């Protein structure tokens, strides 16, 4: 499976990946920290 | 736009402009109260010209009716 | 060169040694040229003789007890009656005003656009000091010195009477007065926290 | 009150909005049965609204005559009137993301110009390479300002022109 | 024509910085502004462009004409 | 080399004989932060003055801290020293820190000449004489001459031991000051109060009985 | 040479054993090069100087019973009328301050800076001691060693004054009196739990 994990390196497949990671990070984070306006302590 | 559509209108970025309005209280609007030159009563600029070109000036900007110096907002 | 002004570091090339006055302080690049070099030269010798001048008057007004280098000229609004040594003075603003306008380009423009002379001998010096024998670079260097520290000096008075409403020695008694509660931190004004 | 404005734990015109809010959840939620699945969600929202409200009033942030918050973009009227979280504080959070974004692409694209061929590990990211350049990205602008300080940030008058 | 005055063909080629501020300046401008019809067209345009936005920003704001702005559609 | 892990391969900017000569090295540098070696020779400098202002600081803590708690003397809490000491003091805060950062910007500035290049101090004519023993030694970061009066650097041998014990009781001090800080933070205790109660209920008053580890 | 300040150490390359005062003492090697060493041979008999004719005068006010060294320049604040032998002097601050300011600089700057010379002999030698012939170095090492000696007894001065706030014999006495309760420790200060 070299070449499947070559694919899975390509351009479209490392973009949906990384960013489902970083938009299910800030949705998470959007959670557990509801509306953040403004930078709290 | 999203902020309004979900019903929240206290999550808007509303970013005041401060740097115009600083303006507008150097040529006499005291309005915001930054009192730096001319919305000043004791400035040298407000008491060096009370006498040539500054009361109508100030009785203009401060009427909220002209489109002299409009109050500003986000 | 008689000093380095951070020392270890290299010195700019476009600074010549035996100029009077050196140290090698230019961060900025700035009189890198020579035709702007030279007119620097021309030109701090001057804001060190007018500042020499600035702060000598600015500091026998106090110590001769006449007010301030400020309130000196506050009697062009509301009121009048200029004084010098308590003499009285007979003039509005717009006759000596004028007259500043006049005399002193007579002086000015007649030093100035004549060449581009900055110690020239002959009947500014009465006494005899500078020969260009021995003693002349020394002379320069402490005339440099004394008017560097007059325009630091001049600036400081600004700074100063902008931040407290003092004059010199109003504040420098109350420096000596409270020297823990009367320096550039107290006001808030310098230090804005 | 900086410019005209007011705490938002001190105008009228706030509290109004939130019991205009809350009015409005609530006539919302005067239809359904209180244990079911629709008046939990609808009480939710009313609780994530009302801590929304104290947190924004605890904040500090100023409203207007709208009722609504403002944000002071000046330092200096924002680190004086304690607002610094509002702009200035996220101006450095961003910019700390932005240059790290910027600086493990641009080290990317520098680690794989002197290859055989750069463009296919660009179209097939090499994943070791950039998930190691994604972790000592971590102190870019202390890399930023050394290379900076050689002239290895920039690139000289090799670059490409067309007629001067 | 007269003696007394300034040049044109003077001030341009003296307003130079060295050090490579501006490289050379502003030297051999007046054998092409003079030349060419497009840069003083050009140049005129940007003026006159400028000035109209002038006459636009302070025309509604300082209204010079008697009972202009109340005319609202004016 | 005695690595800070054992099976890790050790960055090899920190396998140089620049680098393996250097006090502490341990191999660590996981986020390859000094991989340029003149920013490994800044951050050498950076630690050794984060280390030794943290051995200042930590000392100037737990020494009168312990000597609070054990009696004969009332030193207060680190946060709460700064509280107390204005109102025993000749000075305001803001005048007493122009103060510092004029005496602590003419040192901090001499430093910064000297590790920009060496050997810049000691250029005669700079002091009035003071100048010959601030060449410092011929490596930076540790200057000795004046700064070393009980004369321990004499010695050519022991002299990467007392390197490498100032460098790990340094950085044990910045990660107690770091900790100072975060078991303030964390419980609104003293430290020497949070180590008492640390060691009367260790196996339940800990960093699991507090909201830091919060699931 | 002539001593050793801590016996079975080696004497340094640096310092010349024909110097006057000369121990070896030089842990910091803070004279190492001879230009520094040059400039502070003649600043350590300038501070012997002043420090002598410093502790002559904190000590005969005292024992000419005047009050002590630190009340003595205490008439600037708080009224006036300073005194000497008993003799008044009718002299505001600024006026003697301009006067300290202007007359020692007049020498001052006519000592230093016209050369290096820390022994001028001719008319600052009016009875005749320092020919130069055999008794200059032990004359001169007499005089580093009461200067050095009255250095200590400043430094102890003001030490002594900011620990007990009195005076040098207003705490000899007491010394003298209470030998094992009027010393350094009894104080809260200089020795800070005991
Ligand atoms: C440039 C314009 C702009 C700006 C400045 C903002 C600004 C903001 N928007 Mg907005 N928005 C915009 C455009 C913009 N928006 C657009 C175009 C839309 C329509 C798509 C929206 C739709 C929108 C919604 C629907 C919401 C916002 C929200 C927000 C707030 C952000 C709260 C948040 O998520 O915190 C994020 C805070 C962080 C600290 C995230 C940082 C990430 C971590 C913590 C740092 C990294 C840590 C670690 C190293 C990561 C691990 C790495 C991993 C590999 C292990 C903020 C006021 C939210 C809000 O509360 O409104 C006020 C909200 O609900 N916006
Ligand atoms: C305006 C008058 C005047 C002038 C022009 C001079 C000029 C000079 N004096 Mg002089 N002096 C004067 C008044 C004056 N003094 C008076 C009134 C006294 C008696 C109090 C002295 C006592 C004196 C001594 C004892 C010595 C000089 C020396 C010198 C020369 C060195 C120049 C220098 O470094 O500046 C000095 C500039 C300063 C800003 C002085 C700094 C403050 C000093 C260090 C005192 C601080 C003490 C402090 C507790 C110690 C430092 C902290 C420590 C605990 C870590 C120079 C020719 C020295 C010399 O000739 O060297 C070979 C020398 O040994 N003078
Ligand atoms: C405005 C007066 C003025 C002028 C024309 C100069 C001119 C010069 N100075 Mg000088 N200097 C001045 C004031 C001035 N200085 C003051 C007040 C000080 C004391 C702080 C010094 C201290 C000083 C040192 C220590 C040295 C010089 C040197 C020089 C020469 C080369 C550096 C250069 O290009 O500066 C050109 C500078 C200007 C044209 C002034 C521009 C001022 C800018 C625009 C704003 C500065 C604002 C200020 C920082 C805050 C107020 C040049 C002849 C070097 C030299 O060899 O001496 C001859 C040198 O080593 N200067
Ligand atoms: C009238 C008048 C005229 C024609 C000039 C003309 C000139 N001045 Mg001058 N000057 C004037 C009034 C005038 N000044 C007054 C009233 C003052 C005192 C406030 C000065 C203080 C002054 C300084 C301090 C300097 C000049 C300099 C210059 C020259 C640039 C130029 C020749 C500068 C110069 O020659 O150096 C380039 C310079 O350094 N002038
Ligand atoms: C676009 C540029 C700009 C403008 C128009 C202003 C405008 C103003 N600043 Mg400001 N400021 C700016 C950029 C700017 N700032 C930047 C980049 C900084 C540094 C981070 C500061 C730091 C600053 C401070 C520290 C202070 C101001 C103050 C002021 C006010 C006078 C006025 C509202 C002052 C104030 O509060 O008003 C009196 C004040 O104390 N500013
Ligand atoms: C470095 C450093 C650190 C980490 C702190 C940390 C702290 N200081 Mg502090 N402080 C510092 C340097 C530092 N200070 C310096 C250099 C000064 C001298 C100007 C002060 C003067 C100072 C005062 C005067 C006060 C603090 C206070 C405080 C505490 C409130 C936050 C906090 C523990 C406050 C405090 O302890 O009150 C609870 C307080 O009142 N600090
Ligand atoms: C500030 C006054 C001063 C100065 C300039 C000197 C200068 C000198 N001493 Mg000397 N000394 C002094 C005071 C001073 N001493 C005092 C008070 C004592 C008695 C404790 C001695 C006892 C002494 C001995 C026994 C010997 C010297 C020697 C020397 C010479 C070489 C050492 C050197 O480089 O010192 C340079 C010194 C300084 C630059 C002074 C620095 C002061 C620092 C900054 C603070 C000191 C803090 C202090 C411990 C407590 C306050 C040099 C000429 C040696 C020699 O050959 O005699 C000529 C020698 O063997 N000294
Ligand atoms: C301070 C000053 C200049 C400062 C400039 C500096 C330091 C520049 C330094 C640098 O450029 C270099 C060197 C190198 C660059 O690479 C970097 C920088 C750092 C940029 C000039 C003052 C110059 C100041 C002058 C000439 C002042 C003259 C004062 C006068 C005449 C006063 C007159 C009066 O006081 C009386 C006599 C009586 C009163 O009653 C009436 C009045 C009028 C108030
Ligand atoms: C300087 C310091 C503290 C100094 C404290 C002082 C002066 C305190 C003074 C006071 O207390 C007193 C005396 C009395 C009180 O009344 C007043 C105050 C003022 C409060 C702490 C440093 C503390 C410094 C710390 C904790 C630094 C930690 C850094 C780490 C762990 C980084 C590790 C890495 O960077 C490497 C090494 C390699 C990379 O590849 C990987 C990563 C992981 C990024
Ligand atoms: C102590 C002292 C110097 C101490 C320095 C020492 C030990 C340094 C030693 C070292 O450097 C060496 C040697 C070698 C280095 O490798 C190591 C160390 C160890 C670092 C100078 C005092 C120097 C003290 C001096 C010069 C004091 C002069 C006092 C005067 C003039 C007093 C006048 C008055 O008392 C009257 C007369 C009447 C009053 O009413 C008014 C006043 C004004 C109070
Ligand atoms: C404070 C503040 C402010 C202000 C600001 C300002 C005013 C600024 C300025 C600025 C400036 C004046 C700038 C300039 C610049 C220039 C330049 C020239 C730059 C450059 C840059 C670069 C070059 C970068 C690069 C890089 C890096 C390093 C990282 C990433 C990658 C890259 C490569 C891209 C405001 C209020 C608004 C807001 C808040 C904050």
Redesign the pocket.
Same mark, same amino acid.
């Given at each position: 499976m070299k070449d499947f994990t070559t694919y899975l390196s390509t351009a479209p497949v490392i973009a949906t990946i990384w960013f489902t990671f970083t938009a299910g990070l800030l949705i998470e984070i959007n959670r557990y920290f509801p509306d953040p306006l403004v930078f709290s302590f | 736009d999203v902020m309004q559509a979900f019903g929240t209108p206290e999550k808007q970025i509303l970013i005041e402009p401060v740097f115009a309005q600083w303006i507008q209280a150097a040529h006499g609007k005291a309005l915001y109260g930054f009192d730096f030159l001319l919305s000043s009563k004791t400035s040298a600029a407000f008491a060096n010209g009370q006498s040539l070109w500054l009361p109508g000036w100030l009785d203009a900007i401060n009427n909220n009716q002209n489109s002299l110096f409009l109050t500003i907002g986000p | 060169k008689a000093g380095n002004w951070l020392p270890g570091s290299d010195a700019p090339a476009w600074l010549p040694d035996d100029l009077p006055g050196n140290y090698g *302080?230019? /961060? @900025?690049? @700035?009189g890198k040229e020579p035709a702007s070099l030279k007119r620097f030269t021309e030109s701090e010798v001057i804001?060190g003789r007018?500042?020499m001048?600035?702060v000598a008057?600015?500091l026998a007004?106090e110590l001769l007890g006449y007010g301030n280098?400020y309130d000196? /000229?506050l009697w062009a609004v509301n009121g009048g009656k200029a004084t010098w040594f308590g003499i009285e003075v007979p003039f509005d603003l717009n006759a000596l005003l004028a007259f500043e306008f006049v005399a002193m380009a007579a002086a000015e423009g007649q030093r100035g656009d004549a060449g581009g002379v900055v110690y020239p001998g002959g009947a500014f010096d009465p006494l005899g000091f500078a020969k260009d024998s021995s003693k002349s670079g020394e002379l320069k260097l402490k005339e440099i010195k004394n008017g560097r520290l007059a325009?630091?000096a *001049? @600036?400081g008075f600004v700074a100063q009477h902008a931040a407290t409403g003092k004059g010199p020695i109003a504040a420098l008694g109350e420096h000596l007065a409270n020297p823990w509660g009367a320096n550039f931190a107290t006001n808030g004004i310098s230090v804005p926290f | 009150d900086i410019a005209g404005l007011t705490p938002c734990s001190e105008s009228k015109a706030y509290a109004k909005l939130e019991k205009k809010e809350l009015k409005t959840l609530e006539k919302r939620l005067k239809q359904y049965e209180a244990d079911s699945a629709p008046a939990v969600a609808l009480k939710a929202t009313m609780e994530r609204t009302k801590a929304r409200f104290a947190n924004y009033a605890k904040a500090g942030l100023l409203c207007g005559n709208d009722g609504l918050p403002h944000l002071i973009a000046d330092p200096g009227l924002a680190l004086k009137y304690g607002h610094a979280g509002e702009v200035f504080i996220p101006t450095f959070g961003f910019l700390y993301v932005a240059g790290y974004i910027g600086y493990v692409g641009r080290q990317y694209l520098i680690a794989v110009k002197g290859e055989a061929k750069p463009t296919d590990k660009e179209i097939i990211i090499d994943v070791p390479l950039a998930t190691k350049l994604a972790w000592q990205g971590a102190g870019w602008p202390l890399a930023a300002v050394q290379e900076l300080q050689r002239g290895t940030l920039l690139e000289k008058e090799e670059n490409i022109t067309v007629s001067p | 024509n007269f003696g007394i005055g300034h040049r044109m063909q003077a001030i341009l080629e003296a307003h130079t910085p060295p050090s490579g501020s501006l490289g050379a300046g502003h030297k051999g401008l007046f054998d092409t502004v003079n030349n060419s019809l497009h840069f003083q067209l050009g140049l005129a345009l940007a003026s006159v462009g400028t000035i109209t936005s002038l006459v636009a920003q302070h025309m509604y704001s300082l209204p010079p004409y008697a009972f202009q702005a109340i005319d609202f559609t004016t | 080399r005695q690595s800070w892990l054992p099976g890790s391969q050790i960055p090899a900017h920190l396998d140089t004989p620049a680098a393996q000569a250097l006090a502490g090295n341990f191999g660590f540098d996981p986020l390859g932060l000094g991989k340029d070696p003149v920013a490994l020779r800044w951050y050498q400098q950076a630690e050794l003055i984060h280390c030794r202002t943290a051995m200042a600081g930590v000392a100037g803590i737990l020494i009168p801290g312990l000597l609070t708690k054990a009696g004969a003397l009332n030193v207060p809490e680190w946060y709460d020293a700064g509280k107390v000491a204005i109102e025993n003091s000749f000075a305001p805060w803001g005048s007493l820190l122009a103060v510092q950062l004029f005496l602590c910007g003419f040192v901090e500035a001499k430093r910064w000449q000297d590790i920009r290049k060496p050997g810049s101090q000691g250029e005669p004519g700079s002091f009035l004489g003071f100048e010959a023993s601030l060449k410092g030694t011929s490596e930076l970061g540790y200057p000795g001459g004046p700064f070393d009066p009980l004369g321990l650097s004499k010695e050519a041998d022991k002299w990467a031991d007392w390197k490498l014990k100032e460098v790990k009781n340094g950085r044990l001090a910045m990660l107690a000051f770091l900790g100072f800080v975060a078991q303030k933070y964390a419980t609104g205790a003293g430290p020497v109060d949070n180590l008492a109660a640390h060691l009367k209920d260790p196996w339940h008053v800990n960093y699991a009985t507090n909201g830091v580890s919060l699931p």
């Amino acid at each position: 499976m070299k070449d499947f994990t070559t694919y899975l390196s390509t351009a479209p497949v490392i973009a949906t990946i990384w960013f489902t990671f970083t938009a299910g990070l800030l949705i998470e984070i959007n959670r557990y920290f509801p509306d953040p306006l403004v930078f709290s302590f | 736009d999203v902020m309004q559509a979900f019903g929240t209108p206290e999550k808007q970025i509303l970013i005041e402009p401060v740097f115009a309005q600083w303006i507008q209280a150097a040529h006499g609007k005291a309005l915001y109260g930054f009192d730096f030159l001319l919305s000043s009563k004791t400035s040298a600029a407000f008491a060096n010209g009370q006498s040539l070109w500054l009361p109508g000036w100030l009785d203009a900007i401060n009427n909220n009716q002209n489109s002299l110096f409009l109050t500003i907002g986000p | 060169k008689a000093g380095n002004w951070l020392p270890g570091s290299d010195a700019p090339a476009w600074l010549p040694d035996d100029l009077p006055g050196n140290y090698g *302080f230019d /961060p @900025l690049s @700035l009189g890198k040229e020579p035709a702007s070099l030279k007119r620097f030269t021309e030109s701090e010798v001057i804001h060190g003789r007018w500042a020499m001048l600035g702060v000598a008057g600015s500091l026998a007004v106090e110590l001769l007890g006449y007010g301030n280098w400020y309130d000196a /000229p506050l009697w062009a609004v509301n009121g009048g009656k200029a004084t010098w040594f308590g003499i009285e003075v007979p003039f509005d603003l717009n006759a000596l005003l004028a007259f500043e306008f006049v005399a002193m380009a007579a002086a000015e423009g007649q030093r100035g656009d004549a060449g581009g002379v900055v110690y020239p001998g002959g009947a500014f010096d009465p006494l005899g000091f500078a020969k260009d024998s021995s003693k002349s670079g020394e002379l320069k260097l402490k005339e440099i010195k004394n008017g560097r520290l007059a325009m630091v000096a *001049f @600036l400081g008075f600004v700074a100063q009477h902008a931040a407290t409403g003092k004059g010199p020695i109003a504040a420098l008694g109350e420096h000596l007065a409270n020297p823990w509660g009367a320096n550039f931190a107290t006001n808030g004004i310098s230090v804005p926290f | 009150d900086i410019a005209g404005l007011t705490p938002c734990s001190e105008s009228k015109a706030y509290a109004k909005l939130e019991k205009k809010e809350l009015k409005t959840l609530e006539k919302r939620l005067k239809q359904y049965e209180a244990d079911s699945a629709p008046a939990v969600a609808l009480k939710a929202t009313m609780e994530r609204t009302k801590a929304r409200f104290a947190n924004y009033a605890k904040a500090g942030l100023l409203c207007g005559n709208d009722g609504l918050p403002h944000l002071i973009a000046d330092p200096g009227l924002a680190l004086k009137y304690g607002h610094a979280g509002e702009v200035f504080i996220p101006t450095f959070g961003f910019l700390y993301v932005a240059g790290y974004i910027g600086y493990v692409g641009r080290q990317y694209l520098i680690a794989v110009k002197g290859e055989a061929k750069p463009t296919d590990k660009e179209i097939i990211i090499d994943v070791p390479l950039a998930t190691k350049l994604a972790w000592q990205g971590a102190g870019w602008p202390l890399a930023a300002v050394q290379e900076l300080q050689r002239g290895t940030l920039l690139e000289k008058e090799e670059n490409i022109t067309v007629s001067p | 024509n007269f003696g007394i005055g300034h040049r044109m063909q003077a001030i341009l080629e003296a307003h130079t910085p060295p050090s490579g501020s501006l490289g050379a300046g502003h030297k051999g401008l007046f054998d092409t502004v003079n030349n060419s019809l497009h840069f003083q067209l050009g140049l005129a345009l940007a003026s006159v462009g400028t000035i109209t936005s002038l006459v636009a920003q302070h025309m509604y704001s300082l209204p010079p004409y008697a009972f202009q702005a109340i005319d609202f559609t004016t | 080399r005695q690595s800070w892990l054992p099976g890790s391969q050790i960055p090899a900017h920190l396998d140089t004989p620049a680098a393996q000569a250097l006090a502490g090295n341990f191999g660590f540098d996981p986020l390859g932060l000094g991989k340029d070696p003149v920013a490994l020779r800044w951050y050498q400098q950076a630690e050794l003055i984060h280390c030794r202002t943290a051995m200042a600081g930590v000392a100037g803590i737990l020494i009168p801290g312990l000597l609070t708690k054990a009696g004969a003397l009332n030193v207060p809490e680190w946060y709460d020293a700064g509280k107390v000491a204005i109102e025993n003091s000749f000075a305001p805060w803001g005048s007493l820190l122009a103060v510092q950062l004029f005496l602590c910007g003419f040192v901090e500035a001499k430093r910064w000449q000297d590790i920009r290049k060496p050997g810049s101090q000691g250029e005669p004519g700079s002091f009035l004489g003071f100048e010959a023993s601030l060449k410092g030694t011929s490596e930076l970061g540790y200057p000795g001459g004046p700064f070393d009066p009980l004369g321990l650097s004499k010695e050519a041998d022991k002299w990467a031991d007392w390197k490498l014990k100032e460098v790990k009781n340094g950085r044990l001090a910045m990660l107690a000051f770091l900790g100072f800080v975060a078991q303030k933070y964390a419980t609104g205790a003293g430290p020497v109060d949070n180590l008492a109660a640390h060691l009367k209920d260790p196996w339940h008053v800990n960093y699991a009985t507090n909201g830091v580890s919060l699931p």
